[PDB]
From a paper:
PDFs are ubiquitous essential metalloenzymes which co-translationally remove the formyl group carried by the initiator methionine in bacteria, mitochondria and chloroplast. Here, we present and characterize a PDF enzyme issued from the bacterium Streptococcus agalactiae (SaPDF) which behaves as an excellent structural platform to describe PDF-inhibitor interactions. Like most other PDFs, SaPDF behaves as a monomer and its crystal structure reveals a classical PDF fold. In addition, SaPDF contains the typical insertions of type 2 PDFs12, including an eight-amino acids loop folded as an α-helix (insertion 2) and a long loop connecting strands β2 and β3 usually referred as the CD-loop (insertion 3).
Author numbering: 2 to 204
Amino acid sequence: AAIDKLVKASHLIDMNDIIREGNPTLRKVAEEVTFPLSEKEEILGEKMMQFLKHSQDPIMAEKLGLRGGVGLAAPQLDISKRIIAVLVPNVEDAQGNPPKEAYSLQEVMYNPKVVSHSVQDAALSDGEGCLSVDREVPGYVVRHARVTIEYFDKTGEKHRLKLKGYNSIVVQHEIDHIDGIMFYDRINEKNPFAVKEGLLILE
Ligand code: NI
Ligand code: NI
Ligand code: NI
Ligand code: NI
Ligand code: NI
Ligand code: NI
Ligand code: NI
Ligand code: NI
């Protein structure tokens, strides 16, 4: 099966492992994982994080033919399980100094969900791109500005976390994948760039 291919020690996830728009798995509601995790599920999480690291390294990205990513969901690998990985780098300052913290968010999350959120909505000014979508898709992807999430890590430890800004957008995008929701489902059907008063546009 798909998972057997992905969990092989020497196997590096690349674009050929990512399923594309139209594949029914992207529209399913992914199954909850049970704890303790299987070895396959633990390894898959690790491989997913590894993919994101590789995608963000200019040379490894070039070697493996990767588009940069800050998140990945298991359904995009044809694995209908509630497993996501998120990796959001902090940026250098104008002087070229590395940030205090390499990442603002770095986690492999099992059974993540939004448990509460702001009334305020937000959207990235630049829209959103999807590793499974090989089309130009313009528009504001309207999301919650702020979310409180729960998830479990690979050990089965439960976490509760409030997110805002870009990190909030990224986690919501990944949770959507495990619910069978695509970013363009949240773009206004008539005017992609419609702005409802109070929408927080993140630059
Ligand atoms: Ni592969
Ligand atoms: Ni391990
Ligand atoms: Ni590596
Ligand atoms: Ni709770
Ligand atoms: Ni609500
Ligand atoms: Ni995506
Ligand atoms: Ni919601
Ligand atoms: Ni539409």
